[PDB]
Amino acid sequence: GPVPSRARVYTDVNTHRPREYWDYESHVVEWGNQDDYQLVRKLGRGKYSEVFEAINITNNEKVVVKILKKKKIKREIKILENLRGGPNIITLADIVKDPVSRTPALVFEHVNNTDFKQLYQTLTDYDIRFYMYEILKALDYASSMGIMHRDVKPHNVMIDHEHRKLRLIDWGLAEFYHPGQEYNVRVASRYFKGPELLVDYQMYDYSLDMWSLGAMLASMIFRKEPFFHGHDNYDQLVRIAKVLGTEDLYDYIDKYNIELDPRFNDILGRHSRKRWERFVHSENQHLVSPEALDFLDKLLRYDHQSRLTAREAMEHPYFYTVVK
Fold it and tell me: Which residues does UniProt mark as catalytic?
């Protein structure tokens, strides 16, 4: 069968916690006052909830209410409470029972966000570095607290560009990392899924989020949306292999004694690893530097154990120019 794997950092953080920290199933929700909040506008609907802009009439603060459509509820709540106050972690302000849905409604602080599409059109080199560093603060904190987000993507980063403020949001897919635990590979959005998910390797860890961050960075510095543009989860791996090469892919699956789905036999082909310069052109060159390429190269590795961790990434020369 497949060879096991463990995170190379923050491996045992949950084992040294009281059961209460990670045993989300046993968590007892503290309920607030639903009448404190007035819904103002529907912002959107996802697979698992509907999201509203609302006002907290007990202070006139704008808030965001997510009305949930089992146990994912307590998991998200527990993770949000565990991470509350951390750098760039969205703040859960309250939990109320919605009278119409009769499900929990999570109340979050508001962030005046700019649509990433419109906001990826304008970011300077400096601002890419600056905001990447801010996202890293959130991922280092989350992982240091034994949590993997599992859905890092531009839609889940809220940026108030005016105040240069960033929050990592939507922890509904997040999980507690337990060494040796097998996890569902049906997480993350297609274009941000790490190779571990695409080859059905279940014993993954925080390093999944670092792949997703790398895919985000590639899209930003190269002005290519998305960077790996698959038609489905299979073609998604082929798109990655056309950049990273098939030999390193086979080395990866060979290391973990993973066998590819045989349907790849007729679609994967043989591909060399490409040099990152291939993707540089007159329209994106001002966002590219040797430091950017080296940083990207160290995130986008097939082998989840070989990627930079969040803290290692923060140490990278790419961020030397960011004022701290």
Answer: 151 (proton acceptor)
**Best CA proximity match to 258, nearest among 191, 196, 212:** 196
Query: Which amino acid, 75?
Result: R
**Assigned token pair, 131:** 């905001």
The answer on whether 47 is annotated among ligand-binding residues is yes
Active-site amino acid positions: 151
- Rounded-to-integer distance, Cα 168 and Cα 170, Å: 7
Alpha carbon distance, N-terminus to C-terminus of the chain: 47
DSSP state, residue 64? E
Annotated binding-site residue? 45: yes
Angle (CA) 81-86-88 rounded to 5° is: 115
> Is 224 labelled as part of a ligand binding site?
no
Annotated ligand binding at 49? The verdict is yes
What would you report as the CA-atom Rg of the chain, rounded to the nearest whole angstrom? Answer: 20
Domains in the chain, CATH or no CATH each = 5-22+111-324 (1.10.510.10), 23-110 (3.30.200.20)
Query: Cβ neighbours of residue 269 under 8 Å, at least 6 residues apart?
Result: 238, 241, 246
Structural biology method used: X-ray
> Among 101, 150, 157, which Cα is nearest to 304's?
150
